Symmetry: C2
Subunit: 139 residues, 2 copies
Protein backbone atom coordinates (compact mmCIF):
# COMPACT_ATOMS: atom_id res chain seq x y z
CA UNK A 1 0.00 0.00 0.00
CA UNK A 2 1.66 3.38 -0.72
CA UNK A 3 1.92 6.54 1.24
CA UNK A 4 -1.57 7.67 1.88
CA UNK A 5 -3.11 4.39 0.79
CA UNK A 6 -2.25 3.98 -2.85
CA UNK A 7 0.05 2.55 -5.38
CA UNK A 8 1.28 3.94 -8.74
CA UNK A 9 -1.08 3.00 -11.49
CA UNK A 10 1.35 0.67 -13.26
CA UNK A 11 2.02 -1.20 -10.02
CA UNK A 12 -1.70 -2.06 -10.02
CA UNK A 13 -1.51 -3.23 -13.71
CA UNK A 14 1.48 -5.46 -12.77
CA UNK A 15 -0.50 -7.12 -9.99
CA UNK A 16 -3.68 -7.42 -12.04
CA UNK A 17 -1.77 -9.21 -14.76
CA UNK A 18 -0.06 -11.50 -12.18
CA UNK A 19 -3.49 -12.59 -11.08
CA UNK A 20 -5.06 -13.17 -14.55
CA UNK A 21 -1.95 -14.97 -15.66
CA UNK A 22 -1.93 -17.16 -12.45
CA UNK A 23 -5.02 -18.69 -13.93
CA UNK A 24 -3.30 -20.27 -16.99
CA UNK A 25 -0.07 -22.16 -16.68
CA UNK A 26 1.20 -22.41 -20.28
CA UNK A 27 4.88 -22.25 -21.19
CA UNK A 28 6.68 -18.88 -21.44
CA UNK A 29 10.07 -19.74 -22.89
CA UNK A 30 11.72 -22.28 -25.15
CA UNK A 31 15.01 -24.13 -25.46
CA UNK A 32 15.48 -22.34 -28.69
CA UNK A 33 14.94 -18.99 -26.91
CA UNK A 34 13.80 -17.49 -30.17
CA UNK A 35 11.38 -14.51 -30.31
CA UNK A 36 8.54 -15.85 -32.43
CA UNK A 37 5.36 -14.24 -31.11
CA UNK A 38 4.19 -10.99 -29.65
CA UNK A 39 1.17 -8.88 -28.74
CA UNK A 40 0.68 -5.43 -30.42
CA UNK A 41 -1.06 -3.05 -27.96
CA UNK A 42 -2.39 0.16 -29.42
CA UNK A 43 -4.86 2.96 -28.87
CA UNK A 44 -5.89 4.31 -25.47
CA UNK A 45 -3.63 7.34 -24.98
CA UNK A 46 0.10 7.66 -24.35
CA UNK A 47 -0.40 7.63 -20.61
CA UNK A 48 -2.71 4.58 -20.59
CA UNK A 49 -0.10 2.76 -22.73
CA UNK A 50 3.01 4.01 -20.79
CA UNK A 51 1.18 2.54 -17.78
CA UNK A 52 0.22 -0.84 -19.34
CA UNK A 53 3.77 -1.26 -20.64
CA UNK A 54 5.47 -0.41 -17.35
CA UNK A 55 3.17 -2.97 -15.73
CA UNK A 56 3.57 -5.81 -18.33
CA UNK A 57 7.25 -5.34 -17.70
CA UNK A 58 7.09 -5.79 -13.89
CA UNK A 59 4.63 -8.66 -14.25
CA UNK A 60 6.49 -10.64 -16.90
CA UNK A 61 10.28 -11.09 -16.69
CA UNK A 62 10.06 -13.22 -19.86
CA UNK A 63 9.06 -10.67 -22.46
CA UNK A 64 10.94 -7.77 -24.08
CA UNK A 65 9.03 -4.51 -24.76
CA UNK A 66 9.55 -1.88 -27.43
CA UNK A 67 9.25 1.83 -26.63
CA UNK A 68 6.02 3.55 -27.58
CA UNK A 69 5.80 4.77 -31.14
CA UNK A 70 3.08 6.33 -33.30
CA UNK A 71 0.89 4.49 -35.72
CA UNK A 72 0.22 5.43 -39.43
CA UNK A 73 -3.26 6.24 -40.81
CA UNK A 74 -5.16 3.57 -42.58
CA UNK A 75 -7.60 4.14 -45.23
CA UNK A 76 -7.26 7.60 -46.52
CA UNK A 77 -4.20 9.23 -44.92
CA UNK A 78 -5.01 13.01 -44.65
CA UNK A 79 -3.49 15.80 -46.93
CA UNK A 80 0.33 15.50 -46.45
CA UNK A 81 3.74 16.90 -47.30
CA UNK A 82 4.99 13.34 -46.81
CA UNK A 83 3.70 10.53 -48.92
CA UNK A 84 0.55 8.83 -47.68
CA UNK A 85 2.38 5.67 -46.47
CA UNK A 86 4.55 7.64 -44.08
CA UNK A 87 1.92 9.85 -42.51
CA UNK A 88 1.52 9.05 -38.88
CA UNK A 89 -1.38 9.47 -36.53
CA UNK A 90 -1.28 10.27 -32.81
CA UNK A 91 -2.37 6.76 -31.93
CA UNK A 92 0.50 4.95 -30.17
CA UNK A 93 1.33 1.25 -29.96
CA UNK A 94 3.99 -0.89 -28.32
CA UNK A 95 4.99 -4.51 -28.88
CA UNK A 96 5.83 -7.31 -26.55
CA UNK A 97 8.23 -9.98 -27.91
CA UNK A 98 7.58 -13.47 -26.60
CA UNK A 99 8.97 -16.99 -27.24
CA UNK A 100 5.84 -19.21 -27.38
CA UNK A 101 2.57 -18.71 -29.18
CA UNK A 102 0.25 -19.83 -26.45
CA UNK A 103 1.79 -17.41 -23.89
CA UNK A 104 1.02 -14.71 -26.47
CA UNK A 105 -2.59 -15.87 -26.73
CA UNK A 106 -2.91 -15.89 -22.89
CA UNK A 107 -1.19 -12.49 -22.56
CA UNK A 108 -3.48 -10.84 -25.14
CA UNK A 109 -6.57 -12.29 -23.29
CA UNK A 110 -5.30 -10.99 -19.91
CA UNK A 111 -4.72 -7.44 -21.38
CA UNK A 112 -8.30 -7.55 -22.76
CA UNK A 113 -9.76 -8.54 -19.40
CA UNK A 114 -7.74 -6.12 -17.34
CA UNK A 115 -8.27 -2.94 -19.36
CA UNK A 116 -12.05 -3.57 -19.56
CA UNK A 117 -12.04 -3.14 -15.75
CA UNK A 118 -10.59 0.38 -16.05
CA UNK A 119 -12.04 3.69 -17.18
CA UNK A 120 -11.62 5.29 -20.60
CA UNK A 121 -9.28 5.85 -22.45
CA UNK A 122 -7.74 2.75 -20.89
CA UNK A 123 -10.72 0.62 -21.62
CA UNK A 124 -10.19 1.53 -25.29
CA UNK A 125 -6.73 -0.03 -25.68
CA UNK A 126 -6.78 -2.75 -28.41
CA UNK A 127 -4.52 -5.77 -28.56
CA UNK A 128 -3.60 -8.42 -31.20
CA UNK A 129 -1.33 -11.39 -31.34
CA UNK A 130 1.30 -11.71 -33.98
CA UNK A 131 3.80 -14.38 -34.98
CA UNK A 132 7.08 -13.66 -36.88
CA UNK A 133 7.71 -16.04 -39.69
CA UNK A 134 11.45 -16.12 -39.20
CA UNK A 135 11.56 -14.94 -35.52
CA UNK A 136 13.21 -11.61 -34.53
CA UNK A 137 16.83 -11.50 -33.40
CA UNK A 138 16.77 -9.00 -30.58
CA UNK A 139 20.34 -7.86 -29.71
CA UNK B 1 18.62 10.42 -54.17
CA UNK B 2 18.60 7.02 -52.53
CA UNK B 3 14.88 7.46 -51.92
CA UNK B 4 13.99 7.10 -55.67
CA UNK B 5 17.08 5.04 -56.41
CA UNK B 6 16.00 2.52 -53.65
CA UNK B 7 12.38 2.94 -54.91
CA UNK B 8 13.45 1.94 -58.44
CA UNK B 9 15.32 -1.04 -57.00
CA UNK B 10 12.26 -2.20 -55.02
CA UNK B 11 10.09 -1.53 -57.95
CA UNK B 12 12.05 -3.83 -60.29
CA UNK B 13 12.38 -6.70 -57.87
CA UNK B 14 8.72 -6.38 -56.92
CA UNK B 15 7.81 -6.18 -60.60
CA UNK B 16 8.74 -9.83 -61.08
CA UNK B 17 5.91 -11.47 -59.04
CA UNK B 18 2.39 -10.07 -59.54
CA UNK B 19 0.30 -10.98 -56.45
CA UNK B 20 -2.62 -9.19 -54.73
CA UNK B 21 -1.71 -6.06 -52.85
CA UNK B 22 -5.24 -5.30 -51.65
CA UNK B 23 -8.43 -6.85 -50.42
CA UNK B 24 -11.95 -5.53 -50.59
CA UNK B 25 -12.01 -5.82 -46.68
CA UNK B 26 -9.11 -3.35 -46.51
CA UNK B 27 -7.75 -5.07 -43.45
CA UNK B 28 -4.17 -4.72 -42.23
CA UNK B 29 -3.35 -8.37 -41.42
CA UNK B 30 0.28 -8.76 -42.46
CA UNK B 31 3.45 -6.80 -42.24
CA UNK B 32 7.15 -7.05 -42.94
CA UNK B 33 9.22 -6.27 -39.79
CA UNK B 34 12.51 -4.65 -40.88
CA UNK B 35 15.49 -4.14 -38.47
CA UNK B 36 19.31 -3.95 -38.01
CA UNK B 37 21.45 -1.78 -40.43
CA UNK B 38 21.88 1.83 -38.95
CA UNK B 39 19.14 4.54 -38.27
CA UNK B 40 20.28 6.12 -41.47
CA UNK B 41 20.19 3.11 -43.97
CA UNK B 42 16.92 1.95 -42.29
CA UNK B 43 15.39 5.45 -42.72
CA UNK B 44 16.49 5.38 -46.36
CA UNK B 45 14.83 2.01 -47.13
CA UNK B 46 11.67 3.19 -45.33
CA UNK B 47 11.40 6.17 -47.66
CA UNK B 48 12.04 4.01 -50.69
CA UNK B 49 9.37 1.38 -49.58
CA UNK B 50 6.91 4.35 -49.30
CA UNK B 51 7.51 5.76 -52.81
CA UNK B 52 7.52 2.27 -54.29
CA UNK B 53 4.42 0.82 -52.62
CA UNK B 54 1.40 3.23 -52.29
CA UNK B 55 -0.70 0.40 -50.87
CA UNK B 56 1.23 0.00 -47.57
CA UNK B 57 1.48 1.95 -44.35
CA UNK B 58 4.76 2.41 -42.38
CA UNK B 59 5.59 2.98 -38.66
CA UNK B 60 8.26 5.55 -37.69
CA UNK B 61 11.61 4.05 -36.75
CA UNK B 62 11.76 2.88 -33.14
CA UNK B 63 14.27 0.94 -30.93
CA UNK B 64 14.46 -2.74 -30.36
CA UNK B 65 14.90 -4.43 -26.89
CA UNK B 66 17.68 -6.73 -25.90
CA UNK B 67 17.17 -10.51 -26.18
CA UNK B 68 18.83 -13.18 -24.21
CA UNK B 69 22.12 -12.68 -22.33
CA UNK B 70 24.19 -15.88 -22.71
CA UNK B 71 25.33 -17.99 -19.77
CA UNK B 72 24.07 -16.54 -16.43
CA UNK B 73 23.36 -13.59 -14.22
CA UNK B 74 22.90 -10.33 -16.01
CA UNK B 75 19.55 -10.83 -17.88
CA UNK B 76 18.49 -7.45 -19.32
CA UNK B 77 14.97 -6.40 -18.29
CA UNK B 78 11.78 -6.16 -20.45
CA UNK B 79 12.18 -2.43 -20.96
CA UNK B 80 15.84 -1.73 -21.80
CA UNK B 81 16.51 -0.70 -25.36
CA UNK B 82 19.20 -1.39 -27.66
CA UNK B 83 20.60 1.01 -30.18
CA UNK B 84 19.15 -1.19 -33.02
CA UNK B 85 16.15 0.37 -34.84
CA UNK B 86 13.19 -1.06 -36.73
CA UNK B 87 9.98 -0.19 -38.60
CA UNK B 88 7.01 -2.12 -39.79
CA UNK B 89 5.24 -2.02 -43.11
CA UNK B 90 1.50 -2.91 -42.80
CA UNK B 91 0.00 -4.85 -45.75
CA UNK B 92 -3.47 -6.17 -46.71
CA UNK B 93 -2.24 -9.59 -47.78
CA UNK B 94 0.12 -12.18 -46.51
CA UNK B 95 1.54 -13.06 -50.01
CA UNK B 96 2.58 -9.54 -50.97
CA UNK B 97 4.35 -9.45 -47.50
CA UNK B 98 6.14 -12.60 -48.78
CA UNK B 99 7.14 -10.85 -51.93
CA UNK B 100 8.28 -7.58 -50.24
CA UNK B 101 10.32 -9.56 -47.60
CA UNK B 102 12.07 -11.27 -50.53
CA UNK B 103 12.52 -8.07 -52.50
CA UNK B 104 14.19 -6.34 -49.44
CA UNK B 105 16.54 -9.28 -48.77
CA UNK B 106 17.69 -9.29 -52.37
CA UNK B 107 18.17 -5.48 -52.66
CA UNK B 108 20.24 -4.85 -49.48
CA UNK B 109 22.23 -8.00 -50.36
CA UNK B 110 23.98 -6.19 -53.20
CA UNK B 111 24.97 -3.31 -50.85
CA UNK B 112 27.87 -2.14 -48.60
CA UNK B 113 27.65 -2.43 -44.88
CA UNK B 114 25.60 -1.31 -43.01
CA UNK B 115 22.83 -1.65 -45.59
CA UNK B 116 23.69 -5.30 -46.08
CA UNK B 117 23.12 -5.87 -42.41
CA UNK B 118 19.34 -5.11 -42.40
CA UNK B 119 17.35 -8.31 -41.57
CA UNK B 120 13.72 -8.69 -42.49
CA UNK B 121 10.90 -11.03 -41.31
CA UNK B 122 7.24 -11.43 -42.34
CA UNK B 123 4.55 -11.20 -39.66
CA UNK B 124 0.82 -11.51 -39.20
CA UNK B 125 -1.72 -10.02 -36.87
CA UNK B 126 -4.50 -12.49 -36.01
CA UNK B 127 -7.25 -9.89 -35.47
CA UNK B 128 -5.76 -7.33 -37.80
CA UNK B 129 -4.51 -3.90 -36.74
CA UNK B 130 -7.18 -1.19 -36.93
CA UNK B 131 -5.08 1.66 -38.23
CA UNK B 132 -6.66 5.15 -37.62
Amino acid sequence: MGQGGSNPKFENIAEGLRALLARSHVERTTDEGTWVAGVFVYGGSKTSLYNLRRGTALAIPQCRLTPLSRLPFGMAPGPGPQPGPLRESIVCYFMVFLQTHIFAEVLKDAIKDLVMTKPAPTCNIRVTVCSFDDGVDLP
